[PDB]
Design a protein around this ligand. Structure first.
Ligand SMILES: *[C@@H]1O[C@H](CO)[C@@H](O)[C@H](O)[C@H]1NC(C)=O
Ligand SMILES: *[C@@H]1O[C@H](CO)[C@@H](O)[C@H](O)[C@H]1NC(C)=O
Lengths: 194, 104
């Protein structure tokens, strides 16, 4: 059965910073195979630690480097049928952040609104990024929107959040199609209060 | 003379790579370009070219249709080889080191 691939503390890693890629499953896989797809593809054979009715294995990157960034996927194997590997886990993109200009995140109408008010967060930058990524602290699903208007010599992506329901700290990133595992410096966290 | 000694050691590396990995360097432009007096002994370059041309990490799902010849080696020596993390590209580099050293 499809294993689970997690990144601790997260897939957005800073250069030279440390990250642990955890491979895990309820199926007792004796070995895990972690595949990286990027500029330098590689596969790592991790030994499965069977414990608590769950098999798990860690791959620790002590100092994050450009060659280690890419789309990781976990496959599981059993010494019973070593030639029959499991279906891959859902792809996990390990991205190096802090490489380009920090975009600016602002709130419309403001960072403090009454419940039901339509909020729209605006991510802007001088650099013409191909995509803007809006991240809500806690959430894993980031929101990608290209840039719509041009304001005061800065390109801007406007993310409509709809009627206000609950608060949150948001951050913003910019990327280029040609460099997919390298993102901008994070925008300064914007706290929305409903 | 020394030109003959050079070709003898180059052919030893070519034969070594082919027999150890169970692959053929025929038509492989990337690898053949490195079979020169200066580039025939650089293990890093050769290991990098084997990965680039034969795509060993792609053997996880059967291989790239363009070249699944390295898969029998990859399965025997890595995916189903009979602790710490083991890198496929490291294993390839270590194998190339022995071929280059035991070539004479
Ligand atoms: C908020 O946006 C929605 C969708 O466009 C629309 O009903 C209207 O513009 C706003 N509704 C409010 C403020 O409830
Ligand atoms: C050998 O390989 C290393 C690493 O790529 C580098 O110094 C260069 O490519 C080669 N050096 C030579 C041929 O002197």
């Amino acid at each position: 059965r499809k294993p689970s691939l997690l990144a601790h503390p997260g897939p957005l890693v800073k250069s030279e910073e440390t990250v642990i890629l955890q491979c895990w499953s309820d199926v007792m896989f004796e070995h895990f195979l972690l595949h990286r797809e990027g500029m330098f593809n590689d596969t790592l054979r991790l030994i499965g630690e069977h414990h608590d009715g769950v098999s798990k294995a860690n791959f620790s990157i002590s100092r994050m480097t450009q060659d280690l960034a890419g789309t990781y996927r976990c496959y599981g194997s059993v010494t019973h049928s070593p030639y029959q590997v499991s279906a891959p886990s859902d792809p996990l993109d390990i991205v190096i952040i802090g490489l380009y200009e920090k975009p600016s995140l602002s709130a419309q109408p403001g960072p403090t609104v009454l419940a039901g008010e339509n909020v729209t967060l605006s991510c802007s930058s001088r650099s013409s990024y191909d995509m803007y990524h809006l991240s809500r602290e806690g959430e894993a699903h980031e929101r990608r929107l290209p840039a719509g208007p041009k304001v005061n010599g800065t390109f801007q992506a406007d993310f409509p959040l709809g009627p206000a329901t609950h608060g949150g700290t948001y951050r913003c990133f910019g990327s280029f199609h040609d460099s997919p595992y390298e993102w901008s410096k994070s925008s300064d966290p914007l706290l929305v209060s409903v | 003379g020394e030109a003959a000694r050079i070709a003898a050691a180059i052919d030893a590396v070519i034969k070594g790579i082919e027999t150890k990995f169970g692959v053929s360097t025929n038509g492989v432009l990337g690898l053949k370009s490195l079979f020169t007096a200066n580039n025939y002994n650089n293990a890093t370059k050769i290991a990098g070219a084997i990965i680039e041309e034969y795509k060993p990490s792609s053997c996880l799902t059967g291989g790239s249709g363009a070249d699944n010849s390295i898969c029998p080696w990859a399965m025997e020596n890595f995916f189903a080889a009979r602790r710490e993390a083991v890198s496929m590209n490291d294993v390839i580099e270590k194998t190339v080191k022995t071929i280059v050293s035991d070539a004479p």
